[PDB]
Design a protein around this ligand. Structure first.
Ligand SMILES: [Zn+2]
Ligand SMILES: [Zn+2]
Ligand SMILES: [Zn+2]
Ligand SMILES: [Zn+2]
Ligand SMILES: [Zn+2]
Lengths: 174, 103, 816, 28, 84
RNA sequence: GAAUCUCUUUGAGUGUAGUAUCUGUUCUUUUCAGUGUAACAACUGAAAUGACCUAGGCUC
């Protein structure tokens, strides 16, 4: 009935769940943490999920989440796969989207130890992100390079100074 | 009794005569039905003694009684000892429904 | 219509379900009726329900189901019109005469409830046209019905009705049944007639003098029932009726003289010693004159008058032996007596009551010739008399010769018996137990007969053979022959493999009586070989085999723990833990009792793991009995061993294991009465989580721990843990369901004696009045229980100041 | 929109308090 | 159902034996009367609390204080003192 | 009891009282009077339409 899935106890301090709600409390019985309902058997649970009140609680949680949350310059040459693994994924899912760059402040890190400098992060869907430290307060930060044409793409940075050789898979940034 | 609600006790002034329990109900407090540590003898009112009904067990009031019935220590501590005559009167729904269920 | 015709459909569907329906169906429909009975019209409820009970096709099963519904509706609605009163009396009234006392009682509860419901005035208006009825059956019924109403509402309120019917010159049957009402009133009230007997006597006396005989007889029986039910007191009243009984005895003879001798005979023991001698001697002449009466009634009365007159001090035992006794034994012991039981009971009991005045050796002396008679059912009665007589008088009177002939006849009549009866066992045993030391020269052949009877092909004679050993074993020890104990024990242990269970259980019982008596080391088989042959017997199923086997194994556990190796004991434990699924009770109680013996024998921790492994089973009997087993282990081997293991076991997430842990803790607390004090302190954080938990079962069961803990831990000086426990309990007062609320209330009452009345009251006085009609309804109950436990103990503790109440008490403010 | 909700919880029941501007309060 | 119907019955019995037992709605007068009776019975019953009341009231005899307490259990006893 | 041969393995009970927990279906408008409630609630009987103005009306 359970489809062989292990439903962890409430106290086990979280393998991804199917429905991330139904638990077993400190006692034996089954619980739905949204609706705060106690169910005796897994069939009653499947009737709860197929019930109307659980849907209402899921939507109310949806709204509850959606309301809150002449100089010197640098040039980088990033190379990508040679049709080695990209042969299994070609379903026009952002495949047309080129790599993207953003300047991030080190004030926020997974470890939060030291900080105080910027990073020129570069990202592509499958591959892993990449960063480059920029101690200099400003370099190559130009002044109206082109003649003010407005296709924002992502931002002034990307259109202003990036090139994506998609035929060879080479991303240049300067 | 404790477990069966439809039963009705007597609760009159206990007389000088001791109640009796059948071999089946033997060794049980008439109040809480506790098999352990007895304390005192039960005593039943005149209107619960008289004739043959005196010989019956004071709990099931069907089988004949043999041993004296005792109040457990706790029912003597709580004082439910001295309430009155602890003789069940009606037989209850359980026993009757058994009798007619079998035949 | 179509909306209310749906109700007319609902009642029909329900009543159908109760009468003919599934168990879980009728069980719920009963609830639906009881809760919905007020919203259905009693016109419709009874108007629909009553026509079913009239037809002849209904079985007793289907009839009692309708009866129960009638009772549950009557006890609720509380007010009823007279036509339905008459109908319900038409249906329920026939039950009082029914063949078995169960139907009698359940038909009696109806009328005793309706008497309160329908009130006094209505039922009497229903009976008045009924007593005048020409029918015999109806009058017979509503005599009993009228008496049930009389006890139900009290007799004085219904008394002038009886006086009217009895004294009525209009109709004769009205006098007749109006007198019978006094009969069944005398029967139901028991000794409690007493004070009312004078008022009742207003009826009987004049109603005795009617020209018609069948009334004169009924009055005579009423005087007998009132005379016996009264007992010695009632004399002062019957003096008025005592005179005409004699002018009636000396003349009317026939069937009436039987009734009047019943009356006077029942009047004797309540008479003064002066009169008793006279009236007895007057009665004895008529008795002797009437010995030859072929009528069963008259013989039954003669046995009554002889039955009573023996108690009179005036007549001497010599007078009885010289005259009355020989005329008694020869006439009333004729073999034609032994055939019909109701007269057998009276003859035997009469002989027994004569045994008091007569010499024991004289009574037994006259009872040896019937024992040696050839007729089997006659020898049986001759046994009954000897049994009860020996039970009263003992054997001290018997000379050696009668002591020989008696036991000879008991051996003979013992060996040819047919029906299964204990009367020999007890009786032949009652002889042995009394004269036991004097039994020795007779003991050798007796045992031999048993040793023959065990080899008999019929199963009954084997039962009866084995049973008589278990009675002799104690007197065989007194006769000192141990070689016969060993020879028996060996022969039984060899016969222990019998096919028939009913005999095998008795065999094991004899084994038990042998083992308890005899020296353990001198047992031949011996025990160490005995037990491994017993362990396969526990799986024999049935019952008696299981019961006797378990009690015997427990006897070994007490006396001989060290013989069987502990692994074999563990085999025993694994068989018992499976065995207690048995439906019977004493099987389970004995099993649980044996776990203490084994845990004492081998060790606690090897048994406890096995028990705790069994709490995961779904069935309730298994879990509860393993809880009791853990309790007994904790008692016998000490709580400090079991308590940490159980408290660890309570950590499991499963519900049933936790509830089982709490219950086992309840039992292990009520089993150790005083100890209990050192151990609290640990278990309050365990009760902490139990009293907190969501479901209503933990809060229930944990309070039961608090009862047994607080009762016998009170006054020890802890009292700071019981305040904690109470602080956790009080919010549960508002909880519904019967089971949790009674356990919680008991918990608060036990905590009252741990905290004291005042320290406990400080919580209650607040909402003791309160606006809410519910909090009030809840707290007045706890105040009721506290008031019953304590009256003068709460007096300093009331919240009363001179301006709080009007009068107060001026003297509580005085100081010297 | 949650019709029964305010009647359960007691809301959308007109009430008045004199001390603050004789103000109205929709729930207890 | 049947259990509550036993609760009412035992209520009627214990209210007969032990006299005052509040049920659900009991007037303040009905309860304060019970309190008064209990208190007076304690004052008279224990010879200690009777000595204390007798010496404190300075009465000539113990029995005067005891009968004073018994008489005080009737309502009309106040007015009776006022007519003296 | 002893002697020989072949092959295999190892090294769904039941009844009596009673709770707890899920799913399904309805929420008639609005006011007054009675019942009821700690207050609500719930239950019981009667009846709002037309017109005007910048949420409101000493409105008709
Ligand atoms: Zn849910
Ligand atoms: Zn009684
Ligand atoms: Zn019994
Ligand atoms: Zn008890
Ligand atoms: Zn305010």
């Amino acid at each position: 009935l359970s489809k062989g899935e292990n439903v962890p106890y409430t106290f086990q301090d979280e393998q991804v769940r199917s429905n991330p709600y139904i638990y077993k409390n400190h006692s034996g019985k089954l619980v739905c943490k949204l609706c705060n309902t106690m169910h005796m058997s897994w069939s009653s649970v499947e009737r709860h999920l197929g019930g109307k009140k659980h849907g209402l609680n899921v939507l109310r949680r949806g709204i509850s989440i959606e309301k809150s949350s002449g100089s010197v310059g640098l040039a980088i040459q990033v190379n990508y796969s040679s049709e080695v693994k990209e042969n299994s994924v070609d379903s026009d899912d952002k495949a047309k989207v080129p790599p993207l760059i953003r300047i991030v402040s080190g004030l926020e890190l997974s470890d939060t130890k030291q900080k105080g400098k910027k990073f020129l992060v570069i990202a592509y869907e499958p591959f892993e992100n990449i960063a480059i430290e920029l101690p200099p307060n400003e370099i190559l930060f130009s002044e109206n390079n082109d003649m003010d044409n407005n296709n924002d793409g992502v931002d002034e940075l990307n259109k202003k100074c990036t090139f994506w050789d998609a035929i060879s898979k080479l991303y240049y940034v300067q | 009794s404790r477990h069966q609600f439809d039963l009705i006790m007597c609760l009159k002034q206990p007389g000088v005569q001791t109640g009796l329990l059948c071999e089946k109900c033997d060794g049980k407090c008439p109040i809480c039905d506790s098999y352990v540590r007895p304390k005192r003898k039960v005593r039943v009112c005149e209107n619960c003694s008289f004739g043959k009904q005196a010989k019956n067990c004071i709990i099931c009031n069907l089988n004949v009684g043999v041993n004296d019935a005792f109040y457990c220590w706790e029912c003597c501590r709580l004082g439910k000892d001295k309430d009155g005559c602890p003789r069940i009167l009606n037989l209850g729904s359980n026993r009757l429904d058994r009798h007619f269920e079998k035949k | 219509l179509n909306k209310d015709e749906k109700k007319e459909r609902t009642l029909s569907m329900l009543l159908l379900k109760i009468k003919n329906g599934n168990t879980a169906s009728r069980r719920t429909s009963m609830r639906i009726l009881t809760d919905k009975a007020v919203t259905f019209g009693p016109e419709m409820i009874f108007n629909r329900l009553l026509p079913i009970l009239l037809d002849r096709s209904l079985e007793d099963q289907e009839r009692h189901l309708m009866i129960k519904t009638i009772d549950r509706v009557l006890y609720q609605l509380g007010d009823l019109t007279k036509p339905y009163v008459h109908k319900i009396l038409v249906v329920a009234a026939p039950l009082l005469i029914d063949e078995d006392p169960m139907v009698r009682s359940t038909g009696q509860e109806i009328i005793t409830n309706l008497s309160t419901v329908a009130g006094l005035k209505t039922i009497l208006t229903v009976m008045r046209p009924d007593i005048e009825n020409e029918d015999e059956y109806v009058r017979n019924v509503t005599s009993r019905a009228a008496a049930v109403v009389a006890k139900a509402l009290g007799v004085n309120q219904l008394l002038p009705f009886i006086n009217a019917a009895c004294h009525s010159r209009k109709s004769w049957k009205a006098r007749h049944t109006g007198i019978k009402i006094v009969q069944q009133i005398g029967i139901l009230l028991g000794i409690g007639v007493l004070n009312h007997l004078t008022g009742l006597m207003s009826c009987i006396k004049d109603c005795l003098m009617d020209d018609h005989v069948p009334v004169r007889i009924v009055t005579a029986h009423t005087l007998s029932t009132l005379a016996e039910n009264s007992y010695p007191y009632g004399i002062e009243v019957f003096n008025v009726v005592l005179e005409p009984l004699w002018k009636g005895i000396r003349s009317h003879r026939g069937k009436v003289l039987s009734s009047f001798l019943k009356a006077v005979g029942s009047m004797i023991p309540l008479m003064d010693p002066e009169y008793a001698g006279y009236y007895t001697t007057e009665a004895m002449r008529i008795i002797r004159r009437e010995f030859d009466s072929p009528d069963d009634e008259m013989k039954k009365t003669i046995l009554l008058v002889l039955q009573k007159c023996s108690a009179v001090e005036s007549i001497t035992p010599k007078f009885l032996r010289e005259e009355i006794a020989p005329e008694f034994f020869q006439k009333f012991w004729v073999r034609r007596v032994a055939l019909d039981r109701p007269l057998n009971k009276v003859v035997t009991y009469t002989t027994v009551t004569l045994a008091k005045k007569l010499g024991c050796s004289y009574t037994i002396d006259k009872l040896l010739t019937p024992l040696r008679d050839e007729a089997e059912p006659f020898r049986t009665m001759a046994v009954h008399a000897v049994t009860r007589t020996v039970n009263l008088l003992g054997t001290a009177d018997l000379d050696e010769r009668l002591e020989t002939r008696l036991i000879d006849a008991l051996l003979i009549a013992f060996q040819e018996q047919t029906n299964s009866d204990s009367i020999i066992f007890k009786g032949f045993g009652a002889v042995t137990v009394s004269l036991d030391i004097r039994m020795k020269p007779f003991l050798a052949p007796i045992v031999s007969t048993i040793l023959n009877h065990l080899k008999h092909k019929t199963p009954l004679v084997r039962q009866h053979a084995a049973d008589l050993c278990a009675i002799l074993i104690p007197v065989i020890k007194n006769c000192h022959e141990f070689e016969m104990l060993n020879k028996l024990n060996i022969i039984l242990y060899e016969s222990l493999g019998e096919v028939y269970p009913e005999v095998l259980g008795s065999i094991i019982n004899a084994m038990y009586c042998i083992t308890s008596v005899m020296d353990l080391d001198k047992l031949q088989p011996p025990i160490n070989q005995i037990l491994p042959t017993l362990t396969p017997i526990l799986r024999n199923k049935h019952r008696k085999v299981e019961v006797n086997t378990i009690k015997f194994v427990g006897l070994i556990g007490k006396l001989a723990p060290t013989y069987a190796p502990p692994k074999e004991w563990m085999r025993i434990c694994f068989e018992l833990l499976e065995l207690l699924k048995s439906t019977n009770k004493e099987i389970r109680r004995s099993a649980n009792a044996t776990f203490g013996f084994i845990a004492e024998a081998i060790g606690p921790h090897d048994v406890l793991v096995a028990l705790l492994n069994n709490l995961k089973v779904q069935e309730r009997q298994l879990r509860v009995c393993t809880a009791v087993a853990i309790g007994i282990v904790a008692k016998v081997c000490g709580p400090y061993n079991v308590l940490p293991v159980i408290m660890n076991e309570y950590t499991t997430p499963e519900t049933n294991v936790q509830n089982g842990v709490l219950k086992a803790m309840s039992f292990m607390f009520e089993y150790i009465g005083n100890m209990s004090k050192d151990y609290i302190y640990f278990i309050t954080p365990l009760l902490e989580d139990a009293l907190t938990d969501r479901d209503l079962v933990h809060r229930q069961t944990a309070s039961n721990v608090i009862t047994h803990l607080a009762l016998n831990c009170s006054g020890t000086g802890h009292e700071d843990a019981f305040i904690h426990l109470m602080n956790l309990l009080i919010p549960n007062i508002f909880e519904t369901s019967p089971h949790a609320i009674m356990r919680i209330l008991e918990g608060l009452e036990a905590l009252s004696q741990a905290l004291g009345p005042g320290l406990f009251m400080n919580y209650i006085w607040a909402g003791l009045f309160h606006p809410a009609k519910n909090v009030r309804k809840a707290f007045w109950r706890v105040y009721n229980n506290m008031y019953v436990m304590y009256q003068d103990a709460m007096v300093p503790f009331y919240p009363v100041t001179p301006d709080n109440n009007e009068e107060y008490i001026e003297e509580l403010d005085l100081v010297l | 929109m949650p019709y029964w909700l305010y009647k359960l919880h007691g809301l959308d029941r007109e009430y008045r308090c004199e001390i603050c501007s004789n103000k109205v309060y929709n729930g207890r | 159902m049947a259990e509550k119907q036993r609760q009412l019955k035992l209520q009627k019995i214990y209210k007969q034996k032990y006299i005052g037992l509040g049920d659900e709605s009991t007037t303040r007068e009905q309860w304060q009367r019970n309190v008064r009776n209990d208190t007076l019975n304690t004052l008279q019953g224990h010879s200690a609390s009777l000595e204390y009341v007798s010496l404190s009231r300075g009465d000539l005899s113990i029995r005067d204080t005891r009968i004073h307490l018994l008489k005080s259990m009737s309502p009309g006893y106040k007015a009776y003192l006022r007519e003296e």
